[PDB]
């Protein structure tokens, strides 16, 4: 069988780290490939023996014995975030065994900490209120809201051409009228600003 | 060149069955069919080998199988259940199984099986305009699109500046929040931001717009209802410039 | 002189769907290994008596390639019988010979790459490794798909690579039991027959391999000369005889192992 | 080292 | 394809030596054939058959064997069953050629 190694991986901005596939038997090949942001598979590599390159990744098969296989991940970028897979062809009925899985996590580097929530209206009507915690450091997580009618979504990065600090953000809103935005600090966060 | 797979989405009741079809270019003999859910790595249900079906794969017979043409093979699910609800890949091969060929996977169909057509419901998107404390503070605004109450989880959020499709400055959530995470069947929610500069959206002369694709009943479902059909439709909210 | 072929047969079964594959190996016209199917465990067998240098990474990579091939012909079978729309109740054989030869030094000399369905040729790779040669109008419909794919380029690699990388390591492995020559032994028994004549035979038992040449010179230069037919133990045997009335003659004896021809009456 | 078939017949 | 067939011994003729009779067939096809070892017209029970093998030209060929003491009294034949003939043909041993 296929045992992929390690299961989960996070790594800081520009961080090398490498992925392993270690088969109990024999293999006449392997794949490497990627989960899509929809739930398919991306084919990265194939290798039949050797070593691949395509960019920040290289994959090898370059086991005499044919046992393992690696793959090679040089200056992790957030556009690297997700899950991996490793499939060696067994060279019997069946012919691919999958490994269960890598998920990549690359955190980027905050040039400048701007923590702050922020109150948006409605351009429609303006009655419903949806307040966002932008800008904080990879280190502070956010936590699901304790409320039926009150809805907080987890992190997540954003890249502008023109070069940002990586804006790090947590939108978060209520159905339940006369809410208070400062009172959504259920997780550990830094004091720094509210609007208020 | 690929392996072509269609439809994008699929959405059938518990009960009723199931088309799922694939087609390649290339002169492939072996072709499978395999199985992901989510967080799970694809199981193979069956594969063919030039109208030679080897169902060694699926040992409870839940799947049906037809391979008319070296290009076409398809799927069939007989009678839909919950636990049919996953993303369904196709592939193919050069030689034989035995071979060391390269497998090409299809993009995939993903397939909800619902307990009846009256939970299905469209999203409403709505934009928010940026806090104008963000403005002074920073000199960049956050425009949020919230798509809400739609069901189940088919929807594609893109981010549309000037009629053109944007992506620099776009994220969007990976995964919905249920509005009920206690009980099944509860329509989801999901959050997307835009960051631009403060002077872009100073500007009343430029038009945001938020994107949803839904993917719900077709045209042969029928729909007994005084509420608006959930079909295959777009919704969508816009914002103009302020200052 | 060095050559290694792998000659492939697939014959048909009356009714059933599996057909029984055999493919079996040479070196130097010396069998090495051979596959079945319809044998108890099917798997790839020694058995030449030098190939116990391999370990059980090598019989267990071979079978998986045998089980592939196995399958290629069963479809190749049914998608021939289609072709000439032959009745779909009797046994059909298909056949391949594919392998390549050496020579004296080690290097590539001459690829070979053929098909055959039933006893009649069917398609072959020609000499440049990039056209193919086929017989008839069905296999014309082969030779299109072959093309259209680029099939040549895969096999051009193989009797390139693989076949000569893997004849190297066979021919280093058992070079003491491959180069083992024997000198014929000759006697000639008479044999009277009608109108006062005698019938010669010069015989020759004892030589490997069977590539000899029996000529019968009468004062330096009608004549019943057979096929060579192997011992059994591990040797050749062949004879020839000539009808002449009735006074001794001679029959040069022509082996590669013999530096002088050896030729000897009674 | 047997020989691999792609296309068949 | 007719297959074609040569009964001789393995071990120059010489009555008293263990010697094995060879029963040759070349140039045939369908690889479909029946061999059958006869000796004074009675079949021999044991015959030791090889595997199935073919020459350069797709023509199949195949060598059978039995053990068999030397006299100048009993008579040695070869009957081979094929789709190709209409009647099991056999040729009769001769130790003179």
Redesign the interface.
């Given at each position: 069988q296929v045992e992929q190694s390690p299961s989960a991986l996070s790594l800081h901005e520009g961080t090398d780290s490498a992925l392993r596939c270690n088969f109990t038997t024999?293999m006449?090949?392997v794949?490497w490939?990627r989960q899509?942001?929809?739930?398919?598979?991306?084919?990265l590599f194939?290798l039949?023996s050797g070593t691949k390159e395509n960019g920040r990744l290289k994959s090898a098969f370059d086991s005499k014995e044919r046992r393992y296989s690696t793959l090679h991940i040089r200056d992790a970028q957030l556009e690297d975030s997700g899950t991996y897979?490793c499939?060696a062809?067994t060279?019997?009925?069946?012919?691919?065994i999958?490994?269960?899985?890598t998920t990549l996590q690359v955190q980027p580097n905050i040039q400048n900490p701007?923590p702050?929530v922020?109150?948006?209206?409605?351009?429609?009507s303006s009655d419903?209120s949806?307040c966002?915690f932008?800008?904080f450091d990879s280190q502070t997580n956010v936590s699901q809201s304790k409320d039926?009618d009150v809805?907080i979504?987890?992190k997540?990065?954003?890249?502008?051409?023109?070069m940002?600090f990586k804006?790090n953000?947590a939108?978060a809103?209520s159905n339940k009228s006369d809410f208070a935005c400062a009172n959504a600090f259920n997780n550990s966060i830094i004091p720094e600003?509210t609007?208020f | 060149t690929t392996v072509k797979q269609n439809p994008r989405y699929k959405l059938a009741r518990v009960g009723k069955p199931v088309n799922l079809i694939c087609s390649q270019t290339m002169n492939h003999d072996?072709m499978?069919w395999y199985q992901?859910k989510?967080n799970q790595?694809?199981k193979?249900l069956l594969?063919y080998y030039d109208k030679i079906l080897?169902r060694?794969?699926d040992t409870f017979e839940k799947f049906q199988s037809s391979r008319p043409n070296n290009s076409f093979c398809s799927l069939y699910i007989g009678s839909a259940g919950l636990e049919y609800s996953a993303?369904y890949?196709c592939?193919s091969?050069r030689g034989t199984?035995?071979?060391?060929?390269?497998?090409?996977?299809?993009?995939?169909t993903?397939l909800t099986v619902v307990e009846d057509l009256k939970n299905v419901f469209p999203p409403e998107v709505?934009?928010?305009?940026?806090?104008e404390?963000?403005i002074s503070?920073?000199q960049?605004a956050?425009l949020?699109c919230?798509a809400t109450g739609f069901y189940p989880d088919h929807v594609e959020l893109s981010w549309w500046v000037n009629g053109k499709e944007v992506h620099?400055?776009?994220?969007?959530?990976?995964?919905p929040?249920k509005?009920?995470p206690a009980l099944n069947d509860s329509r989801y929610?999901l959050?997307s931001?835009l960051?631009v500069?403060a002077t872009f959206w100073q500007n009343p002369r430029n038009h945001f717009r938020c994107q949803v694709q839904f993917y719900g009943l077709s045209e042969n479902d029928e729909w007994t209802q005084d509420r608006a059909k959930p079909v295959t439709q777009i919704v969508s909210?816009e914002?103009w410039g302020r200052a | 002189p060095h050559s290694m072929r792998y000659f492939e047969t697939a014959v048909s079964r009356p009714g059933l769907e599996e057909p029984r594959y055999i493919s079996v190996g040479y070196v130097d016209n010396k069998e090495f290994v051979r596959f079945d199917s319809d044998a108890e465990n099917p798997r790839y067998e020694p058995r030449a008596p030098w190939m116990e240098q391999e370990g059980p990474?090598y019989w267990?990579?071979e079978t998986?390639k045998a089980?592939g091939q196995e399958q290629w012909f069963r479809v190749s079978l049914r998608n021939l019988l289609g072709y000439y729309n032959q009745s779909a109740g009797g046994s059909h054989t298909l056949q391949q010979m594919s392998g390549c030869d050496l020579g004296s030094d080690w290097r590539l000399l001459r690829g070979y790459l053929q098909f055959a369905y039933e006893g009649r040729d069917y398609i072959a790779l020609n000499e440049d490794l990039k056209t193919w040669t086929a017989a008839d109008m069905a296999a014309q419909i082969t030779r299109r798909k072959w093309e259209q794919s680029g099939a040549a380029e895969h096999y051009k690699a193989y009797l390139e690579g693989e076949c000569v990388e893997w004849l190297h390591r066979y021919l280093k492995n058992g070079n003491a039991t491959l180069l083992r020559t024997d000198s014929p032994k000759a006697h000639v028994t008479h044999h009277p027959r009608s109108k006062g004549e005698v019938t010669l035979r010069c015989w020759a038992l004892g030589f490997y391999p069977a590539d000899i040449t029996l000529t019968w010179q009468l004062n330096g230069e009608d004549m019943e000369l057979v096929e060579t037919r192997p011992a059994g133990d591990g040797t050749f045997q062949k004879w020839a005889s000539v009808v002449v009335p009735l006074q001794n003659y001679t029959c040069r004896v022509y082996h590669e192992g013999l530096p002088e021809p050896l030729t000897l009456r009674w | 080292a047997s020989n691999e078939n792609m296309e068949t017949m | 394809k007719t297959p074609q067939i040569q009964v001789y011994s393995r071990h120059p003729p010489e009555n008293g030596k263990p010697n094995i009779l060879n029963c040759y067939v070349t140039q045939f096809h369908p690889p479909h054939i029946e061999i059958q070892m006869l000796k004074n017209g009675k079949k021999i029970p044991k015959v030791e058959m090889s595997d199935m093998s073919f020459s350069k030209d797709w023509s199949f060929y195949i060598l059978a064997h039995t053990e068999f003491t030397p006299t100048e009294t009993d008579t040695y034949a070869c009957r081979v069953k094929h789709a190709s003939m209409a009647e099991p043909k056999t040729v009769y041993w001769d130790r003179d050629m």
């Open positions: 024999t006449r090949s794949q490939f899509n942001s929809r739930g398919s598979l991306i084919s194939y039949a897979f499939a062809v060279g019997n009925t069946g012919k691919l999958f490994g269960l899985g701007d702050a922020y109150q948006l209206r409605d351009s429609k419903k949806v966002l932008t800008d039926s809805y979504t987890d997540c990065v954003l890249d502008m051409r023109s940002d804006s953000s939108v809103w600003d609007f | 072996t499978y992901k989510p790595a694809p193979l594969f080897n060694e794969a993303m890949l592939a091969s199984i035995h071979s060391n060929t390269e497998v090409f996977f299809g993009k995939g993903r709505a934009v928010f305009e940026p806090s404390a963000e503070h920073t960049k956050t949020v919230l620099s400055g776009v994220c969007t959530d990976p995964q929040l509005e009920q929610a959050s931001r960051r500069s909210a914002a | 990474e267990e990579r998986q089980k | - | -």
